[model samples]
Target: GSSGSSGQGHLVHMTVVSGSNVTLNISESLPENYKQLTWFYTFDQKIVEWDSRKSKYFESKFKGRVRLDPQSGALYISKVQKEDNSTYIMRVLKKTGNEQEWKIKLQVLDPVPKPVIKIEK
Candidate 1:
């Protein structure tokens, strides 16, 4: 079965362990007319960007640990940290100038606490 591109949007909430990896999937799959895809940690920080000519990797804590799927607007962050427990946004820009945004909020929790000794007995 042939599936055509379906565009959509929504906010996603994901939780993960501090030392693990996580993939944040977008509700929208980019169309062929794509020109750019950008993930912003905030207004002051950009994680990555895929443009018509090339990809831009910005300087940030996410520099070496983050990845992006230009076609799907998906984000992959490795060795996620508690510092990443914040909201991120993906901006998808079409070649002709249409834009779509998807919001993702990440919660990075510490590893489960180990069981305590039975010395209380």
Candidate 2:
């Protein structure tokens, strides 16, 4: 799904188990145009963060764990652990030395342990 660019951004969501792998696929609305994209994750909005070599942000913790698929428009998060439980935010922009932006949010979560049910009802 997609919408016209309004700088309001788009969003994607997913759920997986801990220590799993997942990907966030994204495509630019304006294809054929030179564009540069940046991906990052944030937890609870209270703690805004970005991917980095150091532990400056919660998202950066999964630096190596997360990678971008060159051939496709997706962010592959590898070795996903419990710590990766949070909302990940991604951004795309045109590096044409002009002002153009597209923001997207990814709500990633770990599946809950299977709950045992008893026929009591």
Which residue pairs clash within candidate 1? none
Global CA lDDT of candidate 2, please?
Answer: 0.50
Highest-scoring model, TM-score: 1
Per-model tally of clashing residue pairs: 0, 1
Q: Pick out the ten consecutive residues of candidate 2 with the lowest summed lDDT.
A: 46-55
Over the stretch 70-100, how does candidate 1's per-residue lDDT look in tens digits? Answer: 5566778888878888888877777777877
Candidate 2 vs. true structure, TM-score: 0.53
lDDT of each: 0.74, 0.50
lDDT of 1: 0.74
